[PDB]
Design a protein around this motif. Sequence first.
Motif, PDB file in Angstrom:
ATOM      1  N   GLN A   2       0.823  -1.202   0.000  1.00  0.00           N
ATOM      2  CA  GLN A   2       0.000   0.000   0.000  1.00  0.00           C
ATOM      3  C   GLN A   2       0.860   1.257   0.000  1.00  0.00           C
ATOM      4  O   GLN A   2       0.492   2.266  -0.608  1.00  0.00           O
ATOM      5  CB  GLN A   2      -0.947  -0.004   1.211  1.00  0.00           C
ATOM      6  CG  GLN A   2      -2.304   0.660   0.973  1.00  0.00           C
ATOM      7  CD  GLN A   2      -2.360   2.107   1.448  1.00  0.00           C
ATOM      8  OE1 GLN A   2      -1.679   2.488   2.401  1.00  0.00           O
ATOM      9  NE2 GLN A   2      -3.187   2.914   0.792  1.00  0.00           N
ATOM     10  N   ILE A   3       2.011   1.215   0.668  1.00  0.00           N
ATOM     11  CA  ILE A   3       2.898   2.367   0.713  1.00  0.00           C
ATOM     12  C   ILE A   3       3.692   2.443  -0.583  1.00  0.00           C
ATOM     13  O   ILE A   3       4.343   1.471  -0.989  1.00  0.00           O
ATOM     14  CB  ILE A   3       3.830   2.286   1.931  1.00  0.00           C
ATOM     15  CG1 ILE A   3       3.032   2.322   3.238  1.00  0.00           C
ATOM     16  CG2 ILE A   3       4.849   3.415   1.897  1.00  0.00           C
ATOM     17  CD1 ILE A   3       2.585   0.960   3.744  1.00  0.00           C
ATOM     18  N   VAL A   4       3.640   3.597  -1.243  1.00  0.00           N
ATOM     19  CA  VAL A   4       4.397   3.853  -2.462  1.00  0.00           C
ATOM     20  C   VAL A   4       5.130   5.178  -2.300  1.00  0.00           C
ATOM     21  O   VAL A   4       4.553   6.161  -1.822  1.00  0.00           O
ATOM     22  CB  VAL A   4       3.490   3.867  -3.706  1.00  0.00           C
ATOM     23  CG1 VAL A   4       3.057   2.457  -4.053  1.00  0.00           C
ATOM     24  CG2 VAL A   4       2.279   4.732  -3.462  1.00  0.00           C
ATOM     25  N   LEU A   5       6.403   5.196  -2.682  1.00  0.00           N
ATOM     26  CA  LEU A   5       7.238   6.367  -2.462  1.00  0.00           C
ATOM     27  C   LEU A   5       6.979   7.446  -3.504  1.00  0.00           C
ATOM     28  O   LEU A   5       6.385   7.204  -4.557  1.00  0.00           O
ATOM     29  CB  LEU A   5       8.720   5.986  -2.477  1.00  0.00           C
ATOM     30  CG  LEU A   5       9.342   5.369  -1.222  1.00  0.00           C
ATOM     31  CD1 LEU A   5       9.359   6.403  -0.109  1.00  0.00           C
ATOM     32  CD2 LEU A   5       8.631   4.109  -0.771  1.00  0.00           C
TER      33      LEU A   5
ATOM     34  N   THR D   1      -4.894   3.693   6.572  1.00  0.00           N
ATOM     35  CA  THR D   1      -5.663   2.470   6.381  1.00  0.00           C
ATOM     36  C   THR D   1      -5.926   2.254   4.894  1.00  0.00           C
ATOM     37  O   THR D   1      -5.623   3.103   4.054  1.00  0.00           O
ATOM     38  CB  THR D   1      -6.982   2.519   7.160  1.00  0.00           C
ATOM     39  OG1 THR D   1      -7.675   3.736   6.860  1.00  0.00           O
ATOM     40  CG2 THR D   1      -6.728   2.431   8.653  1.00  0.00           C
ATOM     41  N   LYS D   2      -6.496   1.089   4.578  1.00  0.00           N
ATOM     42  CA  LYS D   2      -6.847   0.783   3.195  1.00  0.00           C
ATOM     43  C   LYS D   2      -7.940   1.716   2.693  1.00  0.00           C
ATOM     44  O   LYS D   2      -7.819   2.316   1.621  1.00  0.00           O
ATOM     45  CB  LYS D   2      -7.278  -0.680   3.076  1.00  0.00           C
ATOM     46  CG  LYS D   2      -7.308  -1.211   1.651  1.00  0.00           C
ATOM     47  CD  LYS D   2      -5.986  -0.987   0.933  1.00  0.00           C
ATOM     48  CE  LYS D   2      -4.845  -1.732   1.609  1.00  0.00           C
ATOM     49  NZ  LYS D   2      -3.550  -1.500   0.913  1.00  0.00           N
ATOM     50  N   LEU D   3      -9.022   1.851   3.460  1.00  0.00           N
ATOM     51  CA  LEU D   3     -10.066   2.843   3.204  1.00  0.00           C
ATOM     52  C   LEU D   3     -10.617   2.689   1.781  1.00  0.00           C
ATOM     53  O   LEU D   3     -10.483   3.564   0.921  1.00  0.00           O
ATOM     54  CB  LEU D   3      -9.521   4.256   3.456  1.00  0.00           C
ATOM     55  CG  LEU D   3     -10.465   5.455   3.395  1.00  0.00           C
ATOM     56  CD1 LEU D   3     -11.482   5.336   4.497  1.00  0.00           C
ATOM     57  CD2 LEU D   3      -9.710   6.757   3.522  1.00  0.00           C
ATOM     58  N   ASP D   4     -11.219   1.519   1.551  1.00  0.00           N
ATOM     59  CA  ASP D   4     -11.798   1.144   0.258  1.00  0.00           C
ATOM     60  C   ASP D   4     -10.730   1.096  -0.842  1.00  0.00           C
ATOM     61  O   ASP D   4     -10.822   1.772  -1.868  1.00  0.00           O
ATOM     62  CB  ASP D   4     -12.947   2.081  -0.129  1.00  0.00           C
ATOM     63  CG  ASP D   4     -14.301   1.549   0.297  1.00  0.00           C
ATOM     64  OD1 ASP D   4     -14.356   0.435   0.859  1.00  0.00           O
ATOM     65  OD2 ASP D   4     -15.313   2.244   0.066  1.00  0.00           O
ATOM     66  N   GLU D   5      -9.707   0.274  -0.597  1.00  0.00           N
ATOM     67  CA  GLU D   5      -8.677  -0.049  -1.589  1.00  0.00           C
ATOM     68  C   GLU D   5      -7.882   1.186  -2.014  1.00  0.00           C
ATOM     69  O   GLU D   5      -7.697   1.458  -3.203  1.00  0.00           O
ATOM     70  CB  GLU D   5      -9.288  -0.753  -2.805  1.00  0.00           C
ATOM     71  CG  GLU D   5     -10.198  -1.923  -2.457  1.00  0.00           C
ATOM     72  CD  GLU D   5      -9.436  -3.218  -2.242  1.00  0.00           C
ATOM     73  OE1 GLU D   5      -8.192  -3.174  -2.142  1.00  0.00           O
ATOM     74  OE2 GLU D   5     -10.084  -4.282  -2.170  1.00  0.00           O
TER      75      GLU D   5
END
Lengths: 414, 101, 51, 51
Positions: A2-5, D1-5
Motif C-alpha cells: 500500500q505504501i508507495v514512495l 488504512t486501506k479505506l476502500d482499496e
Amino acid sequence: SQIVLKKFLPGFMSDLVLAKTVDRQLLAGEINSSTGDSVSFKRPHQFSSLRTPTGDISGQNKNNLISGKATGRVGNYITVAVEYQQLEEAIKLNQLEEILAPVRQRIVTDLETELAHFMMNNGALSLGSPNTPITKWSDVAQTASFLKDLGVNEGENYAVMDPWSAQRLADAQTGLHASDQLVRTAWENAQIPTNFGGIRALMSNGLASRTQGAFGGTLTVKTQPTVTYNAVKDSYQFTVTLTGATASVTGFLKAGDQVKFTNTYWLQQQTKQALYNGATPISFTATVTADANSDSGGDVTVTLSGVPIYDTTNPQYNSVSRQVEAGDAVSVVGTASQTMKPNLFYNKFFCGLGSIPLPKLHSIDSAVATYEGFSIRVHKYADGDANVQKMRFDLLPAYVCFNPHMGGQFFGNP
Amino acid sequence: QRIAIEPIYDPSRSVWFDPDAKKYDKSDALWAFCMYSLSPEKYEAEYGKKPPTSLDVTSMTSWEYNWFGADVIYIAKYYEVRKESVDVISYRHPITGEIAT
Amino acid sequence: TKLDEQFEKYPKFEINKVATELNRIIAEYRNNRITVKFRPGDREASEELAN
Amino acid sequence: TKLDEQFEKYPKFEINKVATELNRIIAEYRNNRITVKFRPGDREASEELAN
C-alpha cells in the motif's frame, strides 16, 4: 504493498551533439510574421578567364552574372498530448510536474532524430564501404583529408561516431609507443582526445539508422539530364532516369542511398582540376532524396542531391570533369537490403536549425517550458464533460541546406 | 574606483554555497553561486546575438504557481578562491619611509 | 465535484491573520536602523583612523 | 488504512507551542553575554599582569 514512495525511479536518456554543432546563427529570428513560411540566402559568385596573345576580347563571350539562392522552410509540428482523469492523476502526483521531466527530453530527442535524418538525406559526399566499420586511425583522418582537398577552409569541420567505435579507437590508442599522457588517459578513462586526425571527433549513442532497399542488375543512365547552372541555381537538385534495373520492385531505392557515377570525377573547386586519391581518382556520388519504385522494363526515375554541373556556356561553375551522358554506368554502394547506422561528417555551414515561437492560445491557460535552449508551449483545456483533462506540448522547427557539397556519410574501408 | 552595496532579489532560489561550509557567515567556503533572471533583449544587448541562449535549470519554482512568461533566461555568477604565487617587490627608498612592499 | 454534470468549485475564502506580527517586526526594524561602526584602539592616532 | 482499496493517510497537524520559552531563554542569554575575566592578586605588579 500500500505504501508507495514519491521518488520516481531513474530512466534512460540520449545524448545531444547534433544541435550544438550545426549553425544556429544565420537562421535565428528570420522567419517572422512578415517573411512568411520560407526565407532565402544568397550564393557566392565565380568567374572564368580568357587567355589570348594580345587581349582582343572582341567576339569571345564575357563572364555572365548569375545569382543563386538557398531557401529554408518550416517543418511539421512536434506534438505530444495526453488525456487522463485529473482526480486519479492528483492521487499522489501534485503540480503536474511528473509529466514535465520525461516529455521535454522526448521532444528534443524527436527533433534531433529528424535533424539527423535530414542531414543524412541531403548529404552528398560518401566515403568507404558501408559494411566495414571503423577500426583504425586512417578511417577518421580520411574525412579531414577529403574536406581539405575539396577546399573548404572558413568554418570548423566535425565528425560523429557511435559508442562502440570510440572504444575501438581508444583501444588502438592504448597501444601507442611514446605519448605518456595519451596512453594513460586511454587506459584509465578510455576517452579519445578532442582533435583526432585534424577533425573534431564526437561520440553519440542516439543516431538515426536506415535500411538499404532491394536493388539489382547492372544499372545505367538512359537519357542525358540537364545539368546547366540555370536549372540547378536554386536547389542543387537534379532528376535522372535509370535502366537495367529489376523487372518490377517496390522501394527499389530508399532514402539515403548513394549513387556513384564511375567515369565522372570530383574537381578541386577553385583550381578546377581532377581529384586523385593517391592510387585512384575519386568518382562523383549523389544521394537519393525520396523513395522510388521500379516499373516494368526496369526504368527507375529518381531525384538526387548534389549536382554534376558541366555547363558549357558558363564554365566557371563546373564541378565535374566530364558531362554525364546517356549510356554511362552507375553503381550503388552497400549490400542489397542490409541495415546500418551511418557515421556523419560535415562542415559548420552545411545545415541550419531554428525554431518559431508560438503565441498563447486565446482564453486557455498556458505556460512555457525550456530545455537545452528550446522553448516548448504547453496548453491545458478541459474539452469533454467526462472528467477528461487534456494537455499538449508544441514545437515548430525550421531547416535549411546551404550547399550539399560539404557533408555526407562515411564508413571504414579495407 | 569605488565600493558599492547592492541588493539581491529572491535569495532562496539564487544563492548557493559550498556544502562544506558550516559557519553562520560562510567564512569557510571555497565557491558560491548567484543567479539572476534576464530577458532575451537584454541578453542580446550585452554579450552577443550570434550564440543562442542556454539557461540554467533548477526545477525549483512553478511549484503551485501559474507561469506565463517564457522570456526569462537564468544566468549565474561564479566565485572562486585560489592560493596563488605572487612576487612582491620591496621598494626601499629611504626618503619618506623606507620599508614598502 | 461533478454536482449534476457540472464542475462547480468549492468556495475558498481567505482571511489573512498571520501577517500582523510580521508587519510589527518589520516596522520595529525600520524605526531603528543599524549600521557598521568602527571603534578606535589604544594608540596615538587610532581615533583619526576610525573617523 | 486501506479505506476502500486506497492508502489515504491520517491528517497530522502540528501546532508548535514548546519553543516560546526556549526562545525567551536564548534571547535572555544573547541580551547579556558573559566572557572570561582575570582578577588580580595581592602583589605589586599583579594589576598589569591581569590587564
